Specification:
The structure is a homotrimer. By secondary structure, chain A is mainly beta. Bound molecules: a molecule of 9 linked components (BGC-GLC-BMA-BGC-GLC-BMA-GCU-GCU-...) (2 copies) and a molecule of 4 linked components (BGC-GLC-BMA-GCU) (3 copies). The PDB classes it as hydrolase.
Chain lengths: 565, 563, 565
């Protein structure tokens, strides 16, 4: 039987003398019953004392803890469900665990982290694991720059062998008080080191970061981190849900997020600003936040099976805003985009700026009666910006009673759709026998007063303006037009879309929209100019018919036939 | 030294009196050696006894277990490999574990769950973890409606912070005896609550559900659950592998399945019936089951890198059947579709109904000599239904010795391919010096007797029916025709496919099929009317020519150029 | 209180006699403090002793270890941080663990595996888990054929119930000394069994395999294994990073890799040679290695959100080489392709052979000034081989100052682009008034001397050779030409690309490249013949202008407009 000691204090005070003897510590703190274990006496060891796994008695004799498996924080005097600052004990336990390439467990309970000293996790040596349940790390009184950083101390080995073997952080709810200047998690390094830090294959999993300034911020050497079941919400910074600043060194390779939830920012968002940066999000959700991309160049974001939505929010914030730079690519593959009603969606929820690319694959474009994107764009479409959009396997909501809209200018079926030619070329104008009829291009005459429009004022007989383009099945389509009836003696006309085969035979599937009699700029086509491309179609023809005696302006004649583009 | 007690019974019987004293329980059950630990005496505590972590001695004094890490079921008297019902002890241990936001471990062994009382896991509080190995939960004698449900007790906090921190279920083989009315796992809530249940980020991993009525069924509040390495097999219900019923409240956001296996249903299948429901399957396999989607609208299922196959099965069941509703989308991206031989595949293995969409990306369409889809469709193609099919990066098996077939009517190269115009518009008819030979549209004369056909009976000189459409390289093509020869002297004629340049000159790569001399409706083109689109092609031409003395009906001239 | 014994030896030596008595083993090895636990005396057990969980005392009485949870290797006398061969104790502990369907833990430490006896993990019964941290399994002195194999003992059940419930291997750095004939991990069976082995749902996670002959090799029954955070590097075999040999039985269903890193092979690579084999790589990276696919038929590899790159390498090795077979499909969806500078990239980094297919989706094609692919291909393009390439949502680096290049021959905008017709068909020749100007096809006259070229030698007035093809928005393009000026009186001419709508109206977005005056074969178009397709474009026209008095050969006029119409 091994001699027994009821507390770490009693273990240290006893004049141990039997080299090699095993002794039992019953508890670190007297009367608690946690943090005990077996220790081997070594009278000759000169190992450094740490009051946890290497204990120096008052006579200098060492007691060396026998550990099997992970180090536990209570071995260093940490206590569960305590008001005392636990960060010193966790930091000391972590320093030791890292020194022997062993993970650190924190027993499930609540903890408070106070002070201002970050814990720097070295993923090549040891992770910190809340074990096991809903481990709560209250950092509301912490005043340092970052609570945790994760960054390797090695430039190559053994990081290339070890980072992947265990997570760097697991099982922790880490939260602040939205104090300015206190970030939650730094992924990588604050400043550029003299050598690189080999961080690839480091995992953060089953953690929540909440109520920091930036909850999660990428630093230098942020490459091939993976995140599983990570939640980030309710940060202070406009960029606080997840921030990738510009100018990072040795960063950007396949930052990966599996089933992560980025949400309820209450003004905080995701912003990717670093060039040459590649991120992959699988089955993630982006809720009540915007995903900004303003990298100078070469950002590639791939969202596979993700959701973008606004649950319970009246905000007109965008979902994805690729706003600057060139050669930036954003993929939405599968998943969903959900647009619950709000007082009026007055800007595009997706935006892709010049020289950038937004790709939609296998996803349904939503529609809602509250859509009012023309307030921003001048016309009724889902996506803004002068970049490029592609579609593959995209579904339109062709049976939505409120309507459907085209997705983007870059998918325009018809040439000179916005009268950007500065004339009516590409359009066939047929005034018929109306010699007094007038059809004219007008500059600064569209909805904004800054764009071209086509004015049609027929006399005696109606005027038809039309255009034909090649089309093929399979496909689905939606068109919107901006129309301003100045005067009309009745229904002012109709916009129609029809299909022909190669032989010129008219096919089923034609649709039309009456213009009515209401004056002023209005959207025509929402629940009328839409449908499926009929099998056998080889041409699509748009016709704008204006009746005799009417005076109507047309702008932004935007049809999209969605197919693989 | 801490005083020691050899059993929970002895711990409770002792007249504890020293407030604050630590004592050691050696074992819950006498002589077993499981479930012991340190306890702290509290003479003043009024905590409720649970015979596990809060023990009330016979004199009223409390003993409070010191726990570090998860709660274990043996702390409440559960025993491994016992014939006694373990569900009460696990349920009591779980109630406590959940009350202190701590997961519950069940030591690896076999357990019997009897009775009829489900365990309701609250993923915002605590999961149940089989630790660690092949933990066997025998529910063959359980008679309740569900074994496990998983549903948060919170509408927002702390669920928004906690659901993701640990799994709800891990490491368990949970099985029944296929008793009607006994389901395995309920994902969410049976009925609509007064407020919502915040379930997002809840995980089920490394579990098998087997031999229930419905193995896995979604309830209300089924949103952002994730499943990893979950197996579901051999259920009783036609919908028993995975069932998402219609009409769920607060459900449908990104239900996610990673490397899950849905298989060997022996009559049970997957069915998604809820509208506005979005599911993602990554490297899953669907084996010897059908994936049905009949949501009224707005289902989106994305299968990335999955396999659909029929290993060891003679069944002609479909693989994917999007059978009703509108605005339903099913994506197959990468992965594989495997069609082992059976006595005859008499219906299409993929089906997409009107107003729905089936997208194929980066996957190879298989072919097998046992394919007989015409028995359903009237004609030889891989996919059924009046919906829309798209392809991107799809490969055809052009060098499959048994043949190749077109994929879908919605990809038809040619106009009026099925004589659905009600006339021969879009088709060029040339008998040359056409006098006494017969070429006629016949209604209700095709393979099923309900569709149009074209009859040709030459006496004079042969007839050519032709059509040209634009095409571009690169591409792969396959055509099937339905042909009915009544009589002919020798070879009855040929169907040919040729390619032209922009100016109309013929290119290499043309193919043809002899009609032969067998009578009755037959498929022409399987291993003949297929190939790669030749370099320089800008037009594709189909030509049907019939010889003197033959009398032949033609129907369903279906070419697909994929790429 | 339970009687206590200080070592396994002392436990065995004692004359136990009281059936049912619980006794405490303090340590397996005297004085260490590891491997102890409670044992129950059993006078009725006739179980075979294993010196771990079933102990036979010197009088024959059995002592049955009370275990809760996994078996631990130290229960069988394994020791941490020891230079004794630990493989026998681990193997004995594993044999027992599998026999009771319980996983085996190895306490985190370093271990040496010597000898030549593999451990055959049965995933239907038990995994081996390094617990928990950077567990180091030194196999440098092991001389057997494989260190670990993973293969089920069952043909159906309970493998169909059990394989998925726990990993087969977790948390281990397993390494050799690059000895020929010693592989690290065999996935499945070495030879075909008479019955199948049901391996689906078996996981290997958080392991590194390093410095073996083949680090990871697929055997028979290799189906529905999943790998998470697995590293494979620095193998000896040319195929040693990951090898899937031809001829495997019962194999190929959805072999799945999540966030795995395949890298730094120093001559070792990935090779997929088995037919009817389907692999999925999600957020993996392939670094300083080639991914070879030479399956006879029906390989399907899907890479979602992966990176292919050459960090720190001067090697001109390919990234992906689909080199043989037919009906092989390789998908690159999202992620990145990175081509750091080297002395000159003289072959294509992607190659797809005849009858195979390489699909690019939502990824940016890189460009670098060191690109010299024409040394292999004859012309300046990114991808080699006579197979097919498709694009969907692909971005070109249109603003890269060094240039941009077309991707592949199969995406050629223009017909007879390589003069492979053996004539000048599809090209429109306009000599103007200069009738004696020479425009001719020349065989074996291109850059390699084995391909056709077009010689243009105008007299008096310049000659224009042109071609028009259909195009549509959305799109972007890059063209390269091989040009050989023999003689010229000045700037030899220019190549230009312009866009028209369906009605023949000219659009913005035209580009041109001067030929200059330097003689000899050169690439024209790198930073000139590129751009975005204008909205409303329905035709693209290339024109090659050669001035009077110039004598120029043209070859390989390769434009790619992505997506190709
Ligand atoms: C305004 C609007 O956009 O309406 C859409 C619905 O239109 C309906 O047609 C009517 C028109 O709106 C009316 O204006 C009028 O129009 C008539 C014209 O049609 C006619 O031509 O001319 C008439 C004049 O003479 C004119 O009056 O009447 C029509 C007919 O009534 C329907 O089309 C309806 O479809 C539904 O019903 C039809 C049918 O019975 O005919 C069925 O076929 C459909 O299956 C059925 O859906 C339209 O509803 C949308 O339908 C889409 C498919 O076409 C579907 O994709 C879409 O659902 C998506 O969007 C909703 C809202 O964003 C999502 O719902 C959310 O889901 C979340 C979970 O993911 C959940 O958390 C959300 O709850 C939160 O938010 C809600 C909320 O209000 O949004 C709150 O209530 C909660 O408190 C909060 O927690 C929410 O449920 C869904 O997931 C997504 O798929 C349908 O909206
Ligand atoms: C030669 C080369 O390819 O240059 C490309 C850059 O061209 C620049 O233009 C200049 C030309 O090169 C010059 O030739 C000349 O050209 C003139 C013409 O412009 C004019 O019209 O005609 C003249 C004829 O008379 C002609 O002389 O001058 C021009 C102008 O200066 C720029 O275009 C440059 O872009 C950058 O600057 C522009 C700008 O300010 O105008 C910005 O708009 C861009 O945003 C900015 O990038 C070109 O650089 C590339 O730009 C691409 C976008 O267009 C971008 O995608 C690409 O980056 C990719 O490739 C690099 C290299 O592979 C990747 O970088 C690596 O990233 C790794 C992590 O993923 C990292 O680990 C690597 O580091 C390791 O390896 C490196 C190494 O490179 O070997 C080692 O050094 C490290 O130690 C090691 O750790 C590496 O950083 C990047 O990730 C990927 O996205 C840009 O290279
Ligand atoms: O094939 C060769 O020529 C040589 O290949 C190996 O050489 C090793 C290789 O250069 C290794 O590169 C490291 C980087 O140093 C490290 O920064 C990290 O690089 C990533 C990069 O993959 C990605 O694109 O961008 C991220 C930043 O976003 C960047 O961090 O990992 C790679 C791969 O491990 O460095 C070691 C040490 O210098 C080299 O040894 C073979 O080992 C050589 O033998 C071989 O000659
Ligand atoms: O930006 C704003 O306007 C406000 O944003 C936050 O508000 C919180 C947000 O409304 C939160 O919504 C919860 C839902 O209550 C919950 O049902 C769940 O919603 C999912 C939904 O994402 C998906 O589309 O469909 C599933 C069902 O399939 C549905 O369950 O999650 C979301 C996100 O957490 O509710 C809380 C509590 O009411 C709101 O506070 C900010 O918190 C506000 O400050 C901000 O003003
Ligand atoms: O629906 C039916 O007709 C019958 O379905 C079940 O029958 C079971 C099924 O045939 C099961 O197949 C096993 C294979 O034996 C096994 O090799 C493995 O197959 C995979 C295959 O999915 C994939 O394509 O290729 C890999 C190799 O790369 C291959 O290993 O798994 C499947 C699915 O579990 O075998 C059992 C035992 O013979 C059958 O019982 C029902 O159980 C029957 O009741 C039903 O009649």
């Amino acid at each position: 039987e091994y001699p027994q000691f009821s507390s770490m204090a009693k273990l240290k005070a006893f004049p141990h003398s039997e080299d090699g003897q095993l002794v039992r510590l019953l508890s670190w703190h007297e009367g608690v019953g946690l943090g005990g274990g077996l220790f081997k006496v070594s009278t000759s060891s000169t190992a450094t004392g740490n009051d946890g796994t290497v204990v120096v008695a008052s006579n200098g004799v060492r007691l060396l803890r026998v550990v099997n498996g992970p180090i536990w924080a209570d071995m260093f005097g940490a206590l569960p469900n305590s008001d005392i600052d636990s960060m010193p004990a966790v930091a000391a336990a972590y320093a030791y665990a890292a020194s022997v390439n062993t993970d650190l467990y924190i027993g499930v309970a609540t903890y408070k982290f106070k002070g201002s000293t970050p814990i720097n996790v070295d993923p090549s040596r040891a992770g910190i694991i809340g074990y096991q349940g809903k481990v709560r790390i209250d950092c509301s009184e912490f005043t340092g720059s970052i609570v945790f950083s994760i960054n390797s101390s090695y430039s190559y080995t053994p990081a290339a062998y070890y980072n992947n073997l265990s997570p760097a952080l697991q099982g922790l709810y880490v939260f602040g008080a939205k104090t300015s200047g206190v970030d939650g998690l730094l992924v990588g390094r604050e400043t550029v080191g003299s050598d690189k830090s080999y961080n690839g294959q480091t995992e953060v999993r089953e953690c929540t970061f909440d109520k920091f300034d930036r909850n999660i911020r990428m630093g230098h050497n942020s490459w091939r981190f993976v995140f599983y079941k990570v939640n980030s919400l309710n940060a202070l910074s406009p960029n606080g849900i997840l921030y990738v600043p510009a100018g990072l060194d040795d960063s950007g390779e396949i930052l990966s997020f599996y089933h992560c939830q980025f949400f309820d920012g209450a003004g905080s968002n995701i912003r990717l600003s670093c060039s040459s940066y590649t991120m992959v999000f699988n089955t993630c959700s982006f809720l009540n936040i915007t995903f900004f991309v303003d990298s100078a160049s070469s950002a590639t974001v791939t969202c596979n099976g993700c959701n973008f939505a606004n649950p319970g929010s009246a905000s007109t914030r965008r979902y994805v805003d690729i706003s600057a730079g060139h050669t930036n690519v954003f993929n939405i593959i599968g998943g969903s985009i959900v647009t619950n009603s709000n007082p009026g969606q007055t800007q595009a929820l997706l935006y892709v700026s010049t020289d950038n690319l937004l790709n939609l694959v296998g996803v349904t474009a939503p529609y809602g009666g509250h859509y009012q994107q023309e307030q921003e764009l001048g016309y009724h479409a889902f996506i803004g910006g002068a970049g490029t959009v592609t579609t593959s396997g995209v579904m339109l909501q062709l049976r939505n009673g409120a309507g459907t809209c085209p997705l983007h200018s870059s998918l325009s079926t018809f040439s000179n759709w916005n009268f950007g030619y500065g004339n009516l070329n590409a359009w066939t104008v047929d005034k018929g026998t109306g010699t007094s009829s007038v059809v004219e291009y007008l500059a600064n005459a569209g909805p904004k007063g800054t764009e071209g429009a086509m004015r049609v004022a027929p006399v005696s007989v109606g005027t038809n303006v039309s255009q034909v383009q090649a089309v093929t099945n399979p496909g689905m389509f939606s068109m919107s037009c901006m129309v301003n009836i100045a005067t009309t003696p009745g229904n002012a006309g109709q916009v129609s879309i029809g299909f022909l085969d190669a032989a010129g035979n008219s096919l089923p599937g034609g649709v039309s929209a009456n213009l009515g009699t209401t004056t002023g700029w209005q959207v025509i086509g929402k629940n009328t100019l839409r449908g499926k491309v009929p099998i056998g179609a080889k041409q699509v023809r748009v016709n704008i018919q204006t009746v005799a005696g009417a005076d109507v302006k047309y702008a932004y004649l935007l049809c999209n036939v969605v197919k693989k583009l």
